[PDB]
Design a protein around this ligand. Structure first.
Ligand SMILES: [Mg+2]
Ligand SMILES: [Mn+2]
Ligand SMILES: [Mn+2]
Ligand SMILES: [Mn+2]
Ligand SMILES: [Mn+2]
Lengths: 423, 422
C-alpha cells in the first residue's frame, strides 16, 4: 500500500473553543454568569476564560502547530498567537486535509478534557449549564457543520451521577460516540469517588445502553505522582504519557467489566507499549488466584480476553510498539494525531506513521486496522457515510489542500495577522 | 538447548536475616542497643526486630516459599512460619540447587532492601553501626561461606554522603559488586535528596571507581502514587512492579551519565516491557530537543546508546517481554528468581523461563545471555571461578538436591518443626 492510499482517523485531538461558544449555547437567563473572555492575569497580551471566580486559558504546549520549537512552553497562550485552525473549525478541516486526516476526535480545553475544571467550581447549576453548552457545541454543532470529519465526543457533569446519566442520554441522541471522563477520579481536586466504589455504575450502565465509549485521556495519573521540589518540565513530559497503567489497572480491578461486560474503554493518548507487560502480569495473576473462586472479570475470561473485547490502545508515534501487536491483538490498536499538541505528528502524520508501520512489517490489512478500522468499529462510526472511501484517503484529502500553507510561522506573526483581522 | 543445560544466575532475591546476625556483627560496645527480637505487636505469634523504639518484621508476601497460596498474605510472619531456607543460608543453597539456580543476589529485609529503615531512625550512629554489621554479614560472611553462590550486594547509610562514600570503599574491598539504593529517594520518609541534586555524586563516583552496580529495586516508586482511600491489595500488587519508568527517567534525566559515563544501573525486579516505549519517547525527545544544544546525556549518545552501555533490565517472568529484545539490545536483559517472594518462580524457575525463551525463539546464545551471561558481565562477576560450568548447570545443581523436599508445606507445619527444635 502507498502512503497516499491510507485512510486515517484520529481518535484523540484537542479543540480550543472559539470566543462565541457560550454566547451561542449558554442559557440566556444565566448569561451574565456565563464564562467570559478576559485578559490572563499573567499575560494581558492573551485572553482567557473567567468563570465562577477563576481564570483559565490554553497551555502553550497544547496549541503549538506550526510554531518554531523555541516558542513552545508552559506559559498561557491565546487566540491571537494560535494558528487559526486550532480554534476555527473551518480552518481546522483544511489543516486536516493537508495532513491527510479523514476524521478527528475533539477533546475539550476550557472545561478540561475530562470536565474537571467545571467539576471544581462551587455553583454546580452554573457548571452544569456550562457542560451542556459545551456539549451542544462540540457534539451537536461542530460534527454537523463538517459531516464525516469529527467523531462526536463529549464530557459529563460527573460531580452528579443522576445529572451525568441524563446528559449521557441527551448527547447520545445527538450522535455522541464517546464521553471523556477523568482517568483517575480519586486524583481530581479533593478527590472524587473511584471506579470500584460503584459511584460510576449508573454512568457505565447508560453508556453501554448507547454503545458509548469511555475515553480515559492521559493527564490524571501524572497528578497522582509525588515529584521532587524543582518542577522539571522534561521529566513531566517523559512520564505523563507512559503511566496509563494506573488508570487501566483501576478500571480492570474495579469489577466494571464483570458488571458491564460490553463496556468500552479507550486509553486515549496512552501509547501501546505499556499494555504487554501489564497483560502478562494480570494474566498470570488470574491464573495464580483462580483457587479463590472469583475474579474482577466475567467468568471464563482472561485479562487478555477482556483487553480484546473491551479496550482500545491509542497512540501517535511509537516505532517499537507494534512489535507486540500480536500479543495485544492487532484489532485493539488505534492511531491518533493529537492535533494541535506538542506531541502531534502534524503535518506529516501519514509519512511518519507509514514509516513505523513498514518497519514493523504491517500487512495492508493491519495498516487499515491501525489507521482507521479499529477506531471505526470501536466508536461505532461509519467513516465513509458522508465521504466515499476513494475520496477519504490521505492522497485525496491532501489534493484539496495544495494551497494550505504549513510552513513554520511564529506566534508573533499569527498575532500580527490577528490584530489586522480585528481592527 | 535442553532445560537441564541452562546456567541460571539470579540478580534479585531476598534474605531474611537470621537471629544471630547482630550478635555476631554489631559492635560489642553497643550491643545493648543492637536490634533485638521481640513479639511483633501486630502478630504475637511471630518475632520481629526491635530497634530504636520501632519494631519491624517480615511480610507474609515475602517469604511464601512452599506455603499453600491461601496462606500468603500481608500479615507479619516470622522464623517459626518460614521454610528454613529463607533465613538459613546452608538450607538456602540446597533450595537453590533444587531450583537449578547457580547464584543469587540477596536484598535485605530488616534494614530495608535499600536501607531506608535504618535511614528513618533518629540515632544515626546506631543506624551506621547496623548498616555496617549487615554488610559484614551479607557481603562478607555469606558469600565467603558459600563461594560462587551469592553475588555480593550491600546497602549504604545514604542519610550521610561522606559515610556512604567511606562504606562503598570499605565493602568494595570485601568483594561487593552492587549497592542497593532507594530508587526514588525523594519519596522516602519526609524525602531525601534526588539524583539530579548532586547529593549522590560522590557515591556514584565511588561506585564507578570499583565498578559497583547501582541496584534500583522496585518498591519506592509505588510510595509516590496517591491511591484512593479504599485499599485493594490486588491493585497494589499489580502496579508495584510495573512503574520502574519513574526511577529510570529520574536517573536518565539527572545528568548522572554525563558526569559518570561508566555508571551502571540495574532496575531490579522492574520487568522488561516498560523499557521499549520509554526509550522510544526518550529517543524522540532528544531528536526534537536537539536545537537546545544541551542534553542530559554524553555527547554523541542517544538514550538507546546509554541504555545499552549503562542499564540492565531485570525480570522473573514476562512471556511477551522478549518481543522487543532487539530494540533494547539483548545484552541488556537479565533473569532473576526473586526467592522467596510471592512473585518467585521457585522451584520450577528453569521450566517456566525455558518455555518463555522457546516461545520467543531465542537462540542458544540469547538463552545464555538472559539466564546468566548479561548479569555476570554487568556485575563483573565470574560465575565459574568456584564452580566449573559443567557442574553449574540446572541439571548438575539439581543432581545435588534430589533428597530436598519441595512439596507444599503449611506454615503451621514449619512452626511445629521449629518449636520442637527450639
Ligand atoms: Mg438497547
Ligand atoms: Mn490527546
Ligand atoms: Mn497531547
Ligand atoms: Mn526482588
Ligand atoms: Mn519481589
Amino acid at each position: 500500500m502507498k502512503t497516499e492510499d491510507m485512510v486515517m482517523i484520529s481518535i484523540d485531538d484537542h479543540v480550543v473553543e472559539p470566543a462565541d461558544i457560550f454566547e451561542k449555547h449558554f442559557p440566556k437567563s444565566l448569561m451574565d454568569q456565563a464564562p467570559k473572555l478576559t485578559a490572563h492575569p499573567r499575560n494581558p497580551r492573551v485572553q482567557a476564560w473567567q468563570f465562577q471566580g477563576t481564570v483559565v486559558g490554553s497551555s502553550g504546549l497544547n496549541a503549538v502547530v506550526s510554531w518554531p520549537k523555541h516558542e513552545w512552553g508552559m506559559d498561557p497562550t491565546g487566540y491571537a498567537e494560535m494558528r487559526p485552525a486550532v480554534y476555527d473549525m473551518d480552518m481546522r478541516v483544511r489543516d486536516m486535509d493537508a495532513n491527510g486526516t479523514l476524521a478527528a476526535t475533539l477533546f475539550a480545553t476550557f472545561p478540561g478534557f475530562a470536565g474537571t475544571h467545571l467539576a471544581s467550581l462551587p455553583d454546580k447549576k452554573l457548571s452544569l449549564a456550562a457542560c451542556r453548552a459545551f456539549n451542544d457545541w462540540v457534539v451537536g454543532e461542530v460534527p454537523d457543520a463538517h459531516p464525516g470529519r469529527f467523531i462526536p465526543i463529549g464530557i459529563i457533569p460527573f460531580f452528579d451521577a443522576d445529572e451525568s446519566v441524563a446528559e449521557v442520554h441527551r448527547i447520545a441522541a445527538m450522535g455522541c460516540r464517546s464521553i471523556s471522563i477523568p482517568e483517575t477520579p480519586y486524583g481530581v481536586g479533593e478527590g472524587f469517588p473511584d471506579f470500584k466504589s460503584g459511584y460510576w455504575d449508573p454512568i457505565f450502565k447508560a453508556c453501554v445502553e448507547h454503545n458509548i465509549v469511555l475515553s480515559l485521556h492521559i493527564g490524571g495519573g501524572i497528578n497522582l505522582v509525588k515529584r521532587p521540589e524543582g518542577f522539571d518540565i522534561d521529566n513531566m513530559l517523559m512520564l505523563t504519557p507512559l503511566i496509563s497503567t494506573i488508570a487501566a489497572t483501576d478500571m480492570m480491578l474495579s469489577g466494571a467489566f464483570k458488571k458491564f461486560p460490553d463496556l468500552k474503554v479507550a486509553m486515549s493518548e496512552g501509547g501501546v507499549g505499556w499494555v504487554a507487560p501489564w497483560l502478562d502480569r494480570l494474566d498470570r495473576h488470574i491464573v495464580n488466584q483462580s483457587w479463590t473462586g472469583t475474579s474482577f472479570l466475567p467468568k471464563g475470561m482472561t485479562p487478555t480476553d477482556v483487553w480484546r473485547k473491551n479496550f482500545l490502545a491509542c497512540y501517535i508515534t511509537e516505532p517499537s510498539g507494534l512489535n507486540n501487536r500480536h500479543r495485544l491483538g492487532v484489532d485493539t490498536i488505534a492511531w491518533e494525531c493529537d492535533y494541535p499538541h506538542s506531541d502531534s505528528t502534524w503535518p506529516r502524520s501519514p509519512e511518519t506513521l507509514k514509516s513505523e508501520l513498514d518497519a514493523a512489517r504491517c500487512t495492508d490489512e493491519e495498516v487499515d486496522k491501525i489507521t482507521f478500522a479499529n477506531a471505526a468499529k470501536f466508536f461505532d462510526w461509519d467513516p465513509f457515510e458522508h465521504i466515499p472511501r476513494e475520496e477519504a484517503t490521505v492522497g485525496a484529502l491532501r489534493a484539496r489542500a495544495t494551497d494550505v500553507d504549513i510552513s513554520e510561522t511564529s506566534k508573533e506573526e499569527y498575532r500580527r495577522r490577528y490584530e489586522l483581522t480585528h481592527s
